[PDB]
Amino acid sequence: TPRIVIIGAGIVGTNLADELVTRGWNNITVLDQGPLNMPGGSTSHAPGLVFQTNPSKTMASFAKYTVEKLLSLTEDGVSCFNQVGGLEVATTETRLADLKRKLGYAAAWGIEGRLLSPAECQELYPLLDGENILGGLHVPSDGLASAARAVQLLIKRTESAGVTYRGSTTVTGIEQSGGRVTGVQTADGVIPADIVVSCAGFWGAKIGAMIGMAVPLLPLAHQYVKTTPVPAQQGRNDQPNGARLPILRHQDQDLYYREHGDRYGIGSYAHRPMPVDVDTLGAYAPETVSEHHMPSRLDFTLEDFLPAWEATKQLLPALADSEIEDGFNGIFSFTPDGGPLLGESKELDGFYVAEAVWVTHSAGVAKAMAELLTTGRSETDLGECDITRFEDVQLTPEYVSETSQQNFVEIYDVLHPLQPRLSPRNLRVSPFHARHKELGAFFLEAGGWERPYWFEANAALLKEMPAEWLPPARDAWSGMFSSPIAAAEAWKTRTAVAMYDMTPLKRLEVSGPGALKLLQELTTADLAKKPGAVTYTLLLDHAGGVRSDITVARLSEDTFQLGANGNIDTAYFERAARHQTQSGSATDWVQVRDTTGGTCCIGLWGPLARDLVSKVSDDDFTNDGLKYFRAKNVVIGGIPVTAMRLSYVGELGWELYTSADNGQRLWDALWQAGQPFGVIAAGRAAFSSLRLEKGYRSWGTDMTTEHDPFEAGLGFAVKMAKESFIGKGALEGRTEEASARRLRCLTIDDGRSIVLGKEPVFYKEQAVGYVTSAAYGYTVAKPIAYSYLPGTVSVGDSVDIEYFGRRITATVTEDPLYDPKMTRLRG
Amino acid sequence: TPRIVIIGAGIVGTNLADELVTRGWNNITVLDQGPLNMPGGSTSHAPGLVFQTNPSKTMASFAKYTVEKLLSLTEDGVSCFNQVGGLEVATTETRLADLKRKLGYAAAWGIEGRLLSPAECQELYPLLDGENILGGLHVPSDGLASAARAVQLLIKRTESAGVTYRGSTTVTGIEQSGGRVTGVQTADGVIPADIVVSCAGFWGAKIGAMIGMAVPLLPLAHQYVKTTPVPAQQGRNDQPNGARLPILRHQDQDLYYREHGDRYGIGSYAHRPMPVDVDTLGAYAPETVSEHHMPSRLDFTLEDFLPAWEATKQLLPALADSEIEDGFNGIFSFTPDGGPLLGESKELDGFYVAEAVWVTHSAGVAKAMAELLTTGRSETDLGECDITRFEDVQLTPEYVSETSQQNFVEIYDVLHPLQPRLSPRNLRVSPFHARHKELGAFFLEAGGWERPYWFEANAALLKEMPAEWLPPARDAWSGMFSSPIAAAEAWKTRTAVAMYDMTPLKRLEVSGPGALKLLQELTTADLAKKPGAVTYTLLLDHAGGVRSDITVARLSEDTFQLGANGNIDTAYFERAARHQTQSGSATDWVQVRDTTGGTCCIGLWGPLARDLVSKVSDDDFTNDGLKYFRAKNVVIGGIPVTAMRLSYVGELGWELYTSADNGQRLWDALWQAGQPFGVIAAGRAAFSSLRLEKGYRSWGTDMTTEHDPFEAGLGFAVKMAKESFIGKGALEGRTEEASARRLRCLTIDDGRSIVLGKEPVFYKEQAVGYVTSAAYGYTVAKPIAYSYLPGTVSVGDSVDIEYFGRRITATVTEDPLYDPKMTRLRG
Amino acid sequence: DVLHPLQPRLSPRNLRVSPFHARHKELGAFFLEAGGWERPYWFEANAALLKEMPAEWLPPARDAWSGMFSSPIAAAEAWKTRTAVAMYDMTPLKRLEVSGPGAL
Numbered sequence A, B: 001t002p003r004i005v006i007i008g009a010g011i012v013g014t015n016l017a018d019e020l021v022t023r024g025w026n027n028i029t030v031l032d033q034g035p036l037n038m039p040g041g042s043t044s045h046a047p048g049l050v051f052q053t054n055p056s057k058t059m060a061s062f063a064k065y066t067v068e069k070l071l072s073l074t075e076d077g078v079s080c081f082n083q084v085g086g087l088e089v090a091t092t093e094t095r096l097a098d099l100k101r102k103l104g105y106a107a108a109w110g111i112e113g114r115l116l117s118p119a120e121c122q123e124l125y126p127l128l129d130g131e132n133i134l135g136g137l138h139v140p141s142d143g144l145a146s147a148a149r150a151v152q153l154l155i156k157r158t159e160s161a162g163v164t165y166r167g168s169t170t171v172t173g174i175e176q177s178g179g180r181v182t183g184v185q186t187a188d189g190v191i192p193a194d195i196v197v198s199c200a201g202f203w204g205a206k207i208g209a210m211i212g213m214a215v216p217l218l219p220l221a222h223q224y225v226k227t228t229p230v231p232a233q234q235g236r237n238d239q240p241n242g243a244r245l246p247i248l249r250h251q252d253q254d255l256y257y258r259e260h261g262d263r264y265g266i267g268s269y270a271h272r273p274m275p276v277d278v279d280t281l282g283a284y285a286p287e288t289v290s291e292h293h294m295p296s297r298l299d300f301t302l303e304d305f306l307p308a309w310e311a312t313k314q315l316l317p318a319l320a321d322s323e324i325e326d327g328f329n330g331i332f333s334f335t336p337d338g339g340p341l342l343g344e345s346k347e348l349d350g351f352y353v354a355e356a357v358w359v360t361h362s363a364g365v366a367k368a369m370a371e372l373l374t375t376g377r378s379e380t381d382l383g384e385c386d387i388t389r390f391e392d393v394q395l396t397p398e399y400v401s402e403t404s405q406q407n408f409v410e411i412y413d414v415l416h417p418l419q420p421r422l423s424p425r426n427l428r429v430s431p432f433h434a435r436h437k438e439l440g441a442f443f444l445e446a447g448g449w450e451r452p453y454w455f456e457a458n459a460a461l462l463k464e465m466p467a468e469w470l471p472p473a474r475d476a477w478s479g480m481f482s483s484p485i486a487a488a489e490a491w492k493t494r495t496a497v498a499m500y501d502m503t504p505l506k507r508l509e510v511s512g513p514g515a516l517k518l519l520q521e522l523t524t525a526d527l528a529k530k531p532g533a534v535t536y537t538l539l540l541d542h543a544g545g546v547r548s549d550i551t552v553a554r555l556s557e558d559t560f561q562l563g564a565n566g567n568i569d570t571a572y573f574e575r576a577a578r579h580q581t582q583s584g585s586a587t588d589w590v591q592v593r594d595t596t597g598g599t600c601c602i603g604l605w606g607p608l609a610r611d612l613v614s615k616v617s618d619d620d621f622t623n624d625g626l627k628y629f630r631a632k633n634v635v636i637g638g639i640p641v642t643a644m645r646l647s648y649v650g651e652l653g654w655e656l657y658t659s660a661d662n663g664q665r666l667w668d669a670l671w672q673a674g675q676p677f678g679v680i681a682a683g684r685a686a687f688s689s690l691r692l693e694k695g696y697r698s699w700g701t702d703m704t705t706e707h708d709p710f711e712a713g714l715g716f717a718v719k720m721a722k723e724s725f726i727g728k729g730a731l732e733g734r735t736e737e738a739s740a741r742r743l744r745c746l747t748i749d750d751g752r753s754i755v756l757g758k759e760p761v762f763y764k765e766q767a768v769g770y771v772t773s774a775a776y777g778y779t780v781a782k783p784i785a786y787s788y789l790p791g792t793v794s795v796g797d798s799v800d801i802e803y804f805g806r807r808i809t810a811t812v813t814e815d816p817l818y819d820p821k822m823t824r825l826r827g
Numbered sequence C: 001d002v003l004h005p006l007q008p009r010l011s012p013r014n015l016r017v018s019p020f021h022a023r024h025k026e027l028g029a030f031f032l033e034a035g036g037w038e039r040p041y042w043f044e045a046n047a048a049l050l051k052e053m054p055a056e057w058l059p060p061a062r063d064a065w066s067g068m069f070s071s072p073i074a075a076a077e078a079w080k081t082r083t084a085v086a087m088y089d090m091t092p093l094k095r096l097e098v099s100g101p102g103a104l
Ligand SMILES: *Cc1cc2c(cc1C)nc1c(=O)[nH]c(=O)nc-1n2C[C@H](O)[C@H](O)[C@H](O)COP(=O)(O)OP(=O)(O)OC[C@H]1O[C@@H](n2cnc3c(N)ncnc32)[C@H](O)[C@@H]1O
Pocket: A007, A008, A009, A010, A011, A012, A013, A031, A032, A033, A034, A039, A040, A041, A042, A043, A044, A045, A046, A047, A048, A049, A050, A169, A170, A171, A172, A199, A200, A201, A202, A203, A207, A222, A223, A224, A267, A329, A330, A331, A332, A333, A354, A355, A356, A357, A358, A359, A360, A361
């Protein structure tokens, strides 16, 4: 098997060694600049609290696996997990409501937990001064990891299986040739490798710069304090590091707690963000590293801890009879969005990262990476962990610094899923931005792009709207980053004509004599059709899982424009094209460009779309001028445009693409043409609700690599008859009808209880699914939610969706909910 | 020699046959759908007035050649030119002033002419009612062409030399294979060809669509009327078509005149534009074509002519005793900018156009095309005639229609060289457009781009400006599309820091394993330098003439960004890259993209540029961070940018390139950083004056293919030591010192008489040059003009520049006028 | 309906605006209204100041109810008012001219 070098003998790198070994890959060298007995990264100081419950399904499965593995990781009859459970307490109404949402995550992801009353909290954790406790969330399977001990036992069992450990060995560079890794440099010459995995914790960026790779993590310090012996605790625990009470979270004050014998450990994020320059740390001579003297531990700054110490004494008064014994400012990693950084680099074949990973998720990440390395894919969706998810503006040191600090500042906050950052904003805007501002655009952002969710100009339309379009009141939570205005935009889209900004849609140009050959192998469609055809198709992995759903427009013999889902797709195409070019003839070369930023697109949609466009174009837009899912070049308002006839909102019209410098003119020409037809600008709130009424899938939530096309209801898009395509062999014999799990459309019975995503779904009182996407449907006048459900659950069955602790009755409904016979889309 | 098919036996196509023959290329078939004896295009109805004098040097040389050739084109002792001279009369002060400018063109282009007083006009042309005549411009060598007769004599002499003519033969298509022309389709099968030249007059667009080529001409009708016998004219001329008086232009009333025996011919553009659908003309059966029955002649619409007929009787009262005998609405071509359309198509190798050409320029265009075909280049600069000069937005049928009609409406107007159209405007704007509007940008346009010439916000700076920067008053003509504000912008650029919009600069990405190989052959620089280098270099033709001056930035091993001069360059690179790819290995492929529209650029220039940028970037901008004429990637205001250190304005700073979606943020970050430093936005008026103070050349005026690098003072940019590059062999042994003509900088002695361009330059009372570029120099505080001058004329000599009839004393000055030791540009 | 005390109408809006309205829009004014006047409650331009603000000025989280029609941005505007200089639109303040020999 391939020669693997792992950089880092933290909890990540030693778990990864371990996960590779058990899969038969043992040609591994593990390097660490610290001594093997105590390498001295963040793992060497972590207190090891593990709270599994997480808004993210993947992160939650990573934590569940880590708990399982640490419990099994044992020597002299002592495991590496002490399963005391975990308790998060609420001291405000906002937090108590949020614990109900978190209990929802628990059930969604298969973690057992309960909400505790104030009295039951006191019974479980008598040290709590009960006066400000409104409630708790108790997960019995949570607990304390012994991460440093786990590292030592992983080293020992992997060593026996052939893995080589070199402590006191500093990586100073990475050797490469022809765009693949060939070795790792040390002052002692090069260690050959076919695969390098950087498991270097908060040194990740420094390692990354050695190959020109932006690794978007920031090292940040976080205070951890142990008290002196707490009188109330005398005699209760085994010394020196026993614990019997659940690990304790006090998220309203940025604090968490564990016992260490009769002492308390207090973790505080209740301080200013503290960026750390890794180049200033110094080279620690290995012989010098000890528990208080290691690169990860900076001097304690007591002044930062004072407020945390007061809140502690308030929550746990017994602690007022102890003192602060020892504290440090410990360094670990943060990232712009709080997700880890995993996967193959863009810059260098065979070079991977598994960085910015808490002890909590370590074994999970290791296992995914081991699957990635040995089989070509991870069994768990890595959409939110892949290093290549980031856009170029999100990779600058300044972006990483500013947003990673804000993620530290907010780490324990209750936040709505649509909550935008206040800064940095306005990084990327489409060419319609000034016009969007004139119309009172309410902008949210993703990928650096500013995106209108609705337009305040259209509030003037609410008085004219037919009552059937008026939605009911929303609760405060579903009402955040939402507006009644979206009803009006949905209304006008369904009955007049609307202009949506499609500019942020990932746009890739795949070009050259090998373009068709590349796309024919990567996609599930037969793309060898005369130019003009637009095909909705999938990208799969070799296990048939859905990596993406895409459109491919063939603009000429050698030129294809793809509408993709984000930069994981870009990176996927980039590498696949480079590999075909390198091992092909002069007829296989192919380039991939991300042209998103240099172009723009208006989705011009609704029943008056042809009336509008005919005023500013002499091109033929009739059905016989341009059929559904066809593209051609046209001129609109004097601007050359590529017109594609499809609509993610389910109405007549076209995506109109042009170069950025032309976009404002193209916008103004249409806007003016559309005055007599009541044209509006329409934003993402309406867009999302309308596409949901159409049943159209959104990659990353409605389906990921954990789903095959037939489970996702996307069989129509797989052309099984193709000689060859990635995933074909895996999908032999499967059908939608025979899928054990299927994506179902739910409508909410009461017409008004909106859900948002991730809420667990119960059939006959058992958790069998979870909301993937949802919105209020303005056309059907009810909340809609999607969920996978067991194949045995049928159209017309009834299911419950738990939202903030309350069961909401919904019915499995046939989709599309709107115009399933596509009457609005054809001729 | 190659098999050539010419489409059209008009004055263009038969002259082209002729010009090819005399150059030894006689394998020619000439096709025309009309009968050979009277093909029935525009040539069959033209009255044949030839006024040589023209603002364009090339057009003027085309007309001079046409006069020479038609005079030599003779049979039975009767030539095809009747050299009666030409007279343009002025009936307003505006026109009289403009005739003085036109006399300037005459001397510039070597055409003999004089300005006539009202009395002398009466003596030359006694029929003129003298009362509104303020003056005339008389060119004795002008005259009347007999174009239909010239066609017949060209046919006869080319036929004898082997050329084949097929009349009554309709081209219905063009055959091609592998991107080159292979034949012309008729109902009688295919006529093979290696080279096709479309000489199809106003059918040009229809021919063009047969290969997918946009031919930006519009067919338009123009009225031409013959009177009955004019009493005053009885007995004076040979019948039936004699003429003795000069051809007569009456541009203030859109009219021109010639005698036909004792009748008058009146040409009127004094009517609404009359677009013609060529598809509605009908197929004329050849046997039916006669003088009054031909595809080019539409029914006369007398109502349109009435006002012209009145003005005629006012100018020439003798005509009031005649009547209108016959009129027609004759069709010919117009183009967006009034230039013809020449050269190789972008779409099809070997397929050329020579279309939208007046009888006046016909032989000239034919000769250039013959040179192009047989030698690879024209001896006359075709910058303003090349079909590939147009930008994509300028090629839509709607753009062509609207602007070609306006060119018809303005054909006889006095217009300032900076006069913008009012419509269509706002086609292309940079990402800084809203910000430019906030600052009161005064926008002119070229290439479809809106470009600020100055910013009204900066008027507030005039009260603070040191008096030495305050320019003198401008006359009305040089003051049009000019503002004192430009002095302030030049001032701030020289002493603080300015932000120029460089977005419209043609930007080409040349990429792939054959990129360096292509550029090494096309340019005069050795580009095989590690990435990061920016090189100013030339593109030449095989005769050493300068096609372009360019920058090449090597961004990576296989990736180069060029800053070019416009779409002639784009088209040149496109074809050259396609040809290398087709006849190369898998290591020679190369793509060219025009990324202008998807990107943007700020030129951040002036002595405080480093102070400004250091506030919003942690990249190293010091001299040791980025040397002059080097590029690197940086981050500014959170935006990835490519920074190139050069300055067409002569100051410290950088061109800052980024993708369009990032541009506004990049703008705002710099704007805000620049507040304490007094940053301004600066426009093209200042830019032009500043670059002139630096002596930097502008392709298309300061040099064209008619100049070699040494004549243009660009020897430094030619690396003669290179093994190989286009033009090298031609330039062996030449030096700047030995050049018979050299580009000289002139400063105007009086400090105030501004010239604009094209004004003739006299040494010791002889016309020896002409102004190529000019501006008021704000830094040296005097008007500057460039001109080629004989090598014998030296620095410190004195020359006169004629501006509106007045000699302005100027001195030949060493350039650069500003900072010639580059102290402002280095370290 | 359950309505927050600051809940604005969506229509009719923009009846009365001060002469600084275009400038307020450039700066990302969040407008509420009373008396027909549009009144900025805070300015989105000033969100860029939050990263520079001393921690002592940073407010705690708000519950959903007190957080409606409220923004952390107001902390920054209060900060700059107390330590630098701020421009408030006082235009809607009822202004009466009492004039004539009986005015006093
Ligand atoms: C600091 C901290 C972290 C922490 C915590 C409390 C504090 C104060 N509480 C946690 C909690 O209760 N629950 C939990 O799940 N995690 C908690 N953490 C975070 C956790 O400590 C880290 O996220 C995790 O330990 C990181 O693991 P990882 O294995 O990724 O990183 P590392 O332990 O830092 O090891 C990286 C190794 O790389 C070696 N290295 C780096 N550069 C080189 C070079 N050039 N050459 C050779 N080796 C290199 C390092 O020496 C290190 O050992």
